[PDB]
A paper describes a structure:
The G protein-coupled receptor [name] is involved in neuromodulation, and one of its agonists is in clinical trials for the treatment of cognitive impairment and negative symptoms of schizophrenia. [name] activation triggers several G protein pathways of which Gq/11 is the primary. Furthermore, the more physiologically relevant intermediate states of [name]–G protein complex structures in the nucleotide-bound forms are also elusive. Here, we report the cryo-electron microscopy (cryo-EM) structures of [name] in complex with a key reference ligand JNJ-63533054 which is an analog of agent TAK-04110 in clinical trial, and miniGs/q or Gi in nucleotide-free form, as well as the [name]–JNJ-63533054–miniGs/q complex in GDP- and GTP-bound states, respectively. To improve the expression and homogeneity of [name], a [name] fusion protein was fused at the N-terminus; the C-terminal residues 322–353 were truncated, and a S622×39V mutation was also introduced (superscript denotes generic residue numbers).
The stable [name]–Gq complex consisting of purified [name], miniGs/q protein and Nb35 in the presence of agonist JNJ-63533054 was obtained in vitro. Importantly, three cryo-EM structures of JNJ-63533054-bound [name]–miniGs/q complex in the nucleotide-free (hereafter referred to as [name]–miniGs/q), GDP-bound and GTP-bound states were determined at global resolutions of 3.2 Å, 3.3 Å and 3.8 Å, respectively. The agonist JNJ-63533054 binds in the prototypical ligand pocket in the bundle of seven transmembrane helices in both the [name]–miniGs/q and [name]–Gi structures. In the [name]–miniGs/q structure, the chlorophenyl moiety of JNJ-63533054 is situated in a hydrophobic pocket lined by the residues I169ECL2, W170ECL2, M2476×54, I2486×55, H2516×58 and V2637×30, and its chloride points toward the gap between TM6 and TM7. The carbonyl oxygen, O1, in JNJ-63533054 forms a weak hydrogen bond with the ND2 of residue N2717×38. The carbonyl oxygen O2 from JNJ-63533054 establishes a hydrogen bond with the NH2 of residue R2446×51. The JNJ-63533054’s phenyl ring is buried in a deep hydrophobic pocket formed by I802×57, F852×62, F1093×33, I1123×36 and L2757×42, where it has cation–π interaction with residue R2446×51and π–π interaction with W2416×48. Interestingly, JNJ-63533054 binds deeper in the [name]–miniGs/q structure and is closer to the toggle-switch residue W2416×48 compared with that of other solved active [name] structures. To decipher the structural basis of the activation of [name], we first investigated R2446×51 that points into the ligand-binding pocket and forms charged interactions with JNJ-63533054, which may be important for [name] activation.
Numbering used by the authors:
A (entry chain B): 3 to 340
B (entry chain A): 9 to 63, 201 to 384
C (entry chain R): 23 to 304
D (entry chain N): 1 to 126
E (entry chain G): 6 to 62
């Protein structure tokens, strides 16, 4: 029966491959050759958020596109005011090895996780005003990789246990778990309708999940190595994945396959963080070679390089208005480009 | 703008407080040296952890081991709560001064696995600047094993019979040239991987430890002293 | 007059070879992000700034202009008051190298307890407390003899002034150079280091000893002659004192230029950064 | 998708010769340090040998050093492991594993839990 | 049985994932093009904003 199971799995894989091949009309490059190229894009460093002692893994812009949270391996969750270049808060964590941080859409709460297998939620606008550990979310067996507030009560959290979990901050319990992966899931990105997110794992596959149903709808494969960065196209019907094979892909949920490769020959370093502009034309990708890159999502032609970091860049976020992008890197500096 | 001015002064005061506390934390972060402890289950890394704990407290998966010797305190990190795949969370330990590797010196079956693990550590793109403090643990078990027969390390490693003990040996009075040859053969195996990459930017410091080896914190103390010394010499123009 | 012609061309070459070098040093270290991580970069930037101050002030407005361009200034307002700041510049150049050597001694002989007693706050304290102390304790350099003005008579203010100059530029700085450097060489060579360190002496201790050796050799003649005007040759030195006094001052100022090749040009990383950044404008 | 399918393998007398092949697919083959991993019956996963991108960093496991000779044909996306003189110890399930990061000389693929880039494997009965 | 059960879960997931209504790649790619060009103007990093409007300078 097991041999029959493998044979029928092969038949289903052949069926999905045939459907993908049939649905492939032409290349996105051919149909976007009627667009004029964007042109060279120069974004100077407006700020250099300089208050971190160790390397920085994650940053997350706020809803107001003014305040942001940055997590460094010293054990701090410094919340800055980008316009004023001021640190409105400096949250002392418990475990210094933090890998993620999330700023809630409302702004009342901030999350952080890491090697402790715990997603800690901090309330900011508390009665006194001193930041405290609001909740301690336990249940992940592997390390913690990416936290993202779905709202003030829930949070989607990826871990090193190949499982994602939709949490309930009010009670501290997993409402529904997303267990369909093979490798360690690193980055997750929520939809504009906050109903279908993706989980980018170390099995060269990103899977699309239902927040309410709790079961994967469509898997997305085609990468050559582990993906540790993922972000939806601003509508929610496409996303991009950055892996260690020095390429960024564009997967289309409607067509259920890859659209275009974003990779040059001279780049041989893995992408660490990806993010789109407010129109979805500037797919910024942070690479291990101490600098970022800017791509034209419709032509794959690289237009702009956000160099300026002395160590590996690890986090990358674009303001909800698209007026800035902050690239926190391992040199403990958050340079806000414009 | 007077209201805006006073509210922004209420922000610069918070910034000043945060700066003061961050300098105070800087006077604590650079005064401690984070250490990372790897190894396998059979390797008695927990015994060394307890021994240096006597010279602090943690039960949340990652067993921190705070210990000070000569008024300087290191911070060991016994991370073991994660899965068997470690190619992604090992990148957090890039700024660690030294990776502590405890190898089970009395296991011939699982010794090639330890060399493979060391080779992976010695060649990571994000670990290629971290010197390793090798710890060949419980040499007493190896001494008992070689001195009782059925210790054909020449079988599991075929290049033992065609091997001779190094001239730069340090034998204890009760030792046997045979157990000395074996225990330096493991060391030379690890240094063979050590002296094959990492062009003068990180070094493997090998040390022999038994089960009850009290002088373990001081050995790491001196090794870290040398590590910091070398990084300062390349940090200056001396090199 | 060749005796007075050689200094003019020598100082022209010194200016055109040292001002661009230290300006490039300031430009490179102003953008080098590691400065706020290590104190040696701050000390080096201070040394470059003091080199700018010295090589501008003493080598231009005292040695080119005042000596062989103008030869007209009234020696009341712009001569003695400007030597007040010129002596301050040279004293700062020496006492920026002093804390740099103390920092190196800490980082080498007590490497593990280094960030505890050396951080870019004590660095700021000692880097802004030497500028001020040199501009404040050089105010006494208002009585500088100008020995060849009109055959002046030596008074007691010049004696104490030159003793203070000695104690502040050579005798104490060389004393605290030699002891620290000898201790470093001792503890780095006569101690069992790593086995793969065959070239552990001629590349580290040789440099660390020649650094102070060249400073001592190039500042010995000026000190010994400013003491010679105190205790030697009342009636005989007048024949050929000016030429060799100028030579001693030339050696003293040549130290200020070799202080670049000994510190910034030595490191391969600095040279690679300079090579990368020299094409920034083009 | 990343698909490493193992061919060869079968009944072996104590001292037989087999051409273990790994028809890999789904990526540019000549960019990864391919390596072999065994699965001894009732025992954990162990490393067999590895070969670099070009074939200049070949390294064998200690036990079987002269018995096994690995060889990759980069233009055929394959990993050969010429296994002659097979002892009963080599009665394991061999696995053809690819290191995750392109252009690197190390990888953590001895993981008992399913490593993402590792084939289904063949059983060689000796 | 555990491996067989995992295989059954995998085949159920694959059957549910291959039975998804897909739309031609040309149409989806053109839709992404149309959305991106219909939102180009509000995007700041594409067409640079005036220095007065820019809050970071
Ligand atoms: C500022 C000072 N410049 C001077 O000190 C000028 N003083 C003399 O030339 C002099 C005075 C009395 C006796 C003798 Cl032997 C010489 C100076 C510092 C460093 C290098 C060169 C010059």
């Amino acid at each position: 029966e097991l041999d029959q199971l493998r044979q029928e799995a092969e038949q289903l894989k052949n069926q999905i491959r045939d459907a993908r091949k049939a649905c492939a009309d032409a290349t996105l490059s051919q149909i976007t050759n009627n667009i004029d190229p964007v042109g060279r894009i120069q974004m100077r460093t407006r700020r250099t958020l300089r208050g971190h002692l160790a390397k920085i893994y994650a940053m997350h812009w706020g809803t107001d596109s003014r305040l942001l949270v940055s997590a460094s391996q010293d054990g701090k969750l410094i919340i800055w005011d980008s316009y004023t270049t001021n640190k409105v808060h400096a949250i002392p964590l418990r475990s210094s090895w933090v890998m993620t941080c999330a700023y809630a859409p409302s702004g009342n709460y901030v999350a952080c996780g890491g090697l402790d297998n715990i997603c800690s939620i901090y309330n900011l606008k508390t009665r006194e005003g001193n930041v405290r550990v609001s909740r301690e979310l336990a249940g992940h067996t592997g390390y913690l990789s990416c936290c993202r507030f779905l709202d003030d009560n829930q949070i989607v959290t990826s871990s090193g246990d190949t499982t994602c979990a939709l949490w309930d901050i009010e009670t501290g319990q997993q409402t529904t778990t997303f267990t369909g992966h093979t490798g360690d899931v690193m980055s997750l990105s929520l939809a504009p309708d906050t109903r279908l997110f993706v989980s980018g794992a170390c099995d060269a596959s990103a899977k699309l999940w239902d927040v309410r149903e709790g079961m994967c709808r469509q898997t997305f494969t085609g990468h050559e190595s582990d993906i540790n960065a993922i972000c939806f196209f601003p509508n929610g019907n496409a996303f991009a994945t950055g892996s260690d094979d020095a390429t960024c892909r564009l997967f289309d949920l409607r067509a259920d396959q890859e659209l275009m490769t974003y990779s040059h020959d001279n780049i041989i370093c893995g992408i660490t963080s990806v993010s789109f502009s407010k129109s979805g034309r500037l797919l910024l990708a942070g690479y291990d070679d101490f600098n970022c890159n800017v791509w034209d999502a419709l032509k794959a032609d690289r237009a702009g390089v956000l160099a300026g970091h002395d160590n590996r860049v690890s986090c990358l976020g674009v303001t909800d208005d698209g007026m800035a992008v902050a690239t926190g890197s391992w040199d403990s500096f958050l340079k806000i480009w414009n | 703008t007077e209201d805006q001015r006073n509210e922004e002064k209420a922000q610069r005061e918070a910034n000043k407080k945060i700066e003061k506390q961050l300098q105070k934390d800087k006077q604590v972060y650079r005064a401690t040296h984070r250490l990372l402890l790897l190894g396998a289950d059979n390797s008695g890394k927990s015994t060394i952890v307890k021994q240096m704990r006597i010279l602090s407290g943690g039960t949340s998966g990652i067993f921190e081991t705070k210990f000070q010797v000569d008024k300087v305190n290191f911070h060991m990190f016994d991370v073991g709560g994660q899965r068997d795949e470690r190619r992604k969370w090992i990148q957090c330990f890039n700024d660690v001064t030294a990776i502590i590797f405890v190898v089970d010196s009395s296991d011939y079956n699982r010794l090639q696995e330890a060399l493979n693990l060391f080779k992976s550590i010695w060649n990571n793109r994000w670990l290629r600047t971290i010197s390793v403090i090798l710890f060949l643990n419980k040499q007493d078990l190896l001494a008992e094993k070689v001195l009782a027969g059925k210790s054909k390390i020449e079988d599991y490693f075929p290049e033992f019979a065609r091997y001779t003990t190094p001239e730069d040996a340090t034998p204890e009075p009760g030792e046997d040239p045979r157990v000395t040859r074996a225990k330096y053969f493991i060391r030379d195996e690890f240094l063979r991987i050590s002296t094959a990459s990492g062009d003068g930017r990180h070094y493997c410091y090998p040390h022999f430890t038994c089960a009850v080896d009290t002088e373990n914190a001081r050995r790491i103390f001196n090794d870290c002293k040398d590590i910091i010394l070398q990084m300062n010499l390349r940090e200056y123009n001396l090199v | 007059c060749g005796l007075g012609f050689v200094p003019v061309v020598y100082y022209s070459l010194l200016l055109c070879l040292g001002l661009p070098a230290n300006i490039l040093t300031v430009i490179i270290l102003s953008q080098l992000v590691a400065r706020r991580q290590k104190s040696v970069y701050n000390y080096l930037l201070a040394l470059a700034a003091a080199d700018i101050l010295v090589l501008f002030f003493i080598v231009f407005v005292d040695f080119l202009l005042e000596d062989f361009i103008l030869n007209m200034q009234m020696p009341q307002v712009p001569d003695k008051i400007i030597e007040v700041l010129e002596f301050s510049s040279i004293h700062t150049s020496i006492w920026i190298t002093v804390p740099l050597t103390i920092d190196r001694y800490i980082a080498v002989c007590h490497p593990l307890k280094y960030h505890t007693v050396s951080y870019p706050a004590r660095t700021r304290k000692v880097i802004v407390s030497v500028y001020i102390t040199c501009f404040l304790t050089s105010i006494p350099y208002y009585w500088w003899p100008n020995i060849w003005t009109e055959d002046y008579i030596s008074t007691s203010v010049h004696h104490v002034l030159i003793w203070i100059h000695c104690f502040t530029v050579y005798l104490v700085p060389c004393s605290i150079f030699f002891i620290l450097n000898s201790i470093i060489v001792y503890k780095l060579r006569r101690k069992s280091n790593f086995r793969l360190r065959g070239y552990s002496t001629g590349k580290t201790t040789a440099i660390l000893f020649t650094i102070t050796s060249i400073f001592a050799t190039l500042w010995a003649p000026r000190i010994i002659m400013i003491l010679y005007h105190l205790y030697g040759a009342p009636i005989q030195n007048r024949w050929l004192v000016h030429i060799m006094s100028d030579i001693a001052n030339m050696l003293a100022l040549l130290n200020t230029a070799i202080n670049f090749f000994l510190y910034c040009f030595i490191s391969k990383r600095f040279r690679t950064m300079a090579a990368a950044t020299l094409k920034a404008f083009f | 998708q990343v698909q490493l399918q193992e061919s060869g393998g079968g009944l072996v007398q104590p001292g037989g010769s087999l051409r273990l092949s790994c028809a890999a697919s789904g990526f540019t083959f000549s960019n990864y340090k391919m390596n072999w991993v065994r699965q001894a019956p009732g025992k954990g996963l162990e490393w067999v040998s590895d070969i670099s991108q070009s074939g200049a960093s070949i390294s064998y496991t200690g036990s079987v050093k002269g018995r096994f000779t690995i060889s990759r044909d980069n233009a055929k996306n394959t990993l050969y492991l010429q296994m002659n003189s097979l002892k009963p110890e080599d009665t394991a399930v061999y696995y053809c594993a690819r290191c995750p990061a392109p252009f690197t000389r190390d990888c953590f693929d001895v993981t008992s839990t399913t490593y993402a880039y590792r084939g289904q494997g063949t059983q060689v009965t000796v | 049985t555990a491996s067989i059960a995992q295989a059954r879960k995998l085949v159920e997931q694959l059957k549910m994932e291959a039975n998804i209504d897909r739309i031609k790649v040309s149409k989806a790619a053109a839709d992404l093009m149309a959305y991106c060009e219909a939102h180009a103007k509000e995007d700041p990093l594409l067409t640079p904003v005036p220095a007065s409007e820019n809050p970071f300078r």
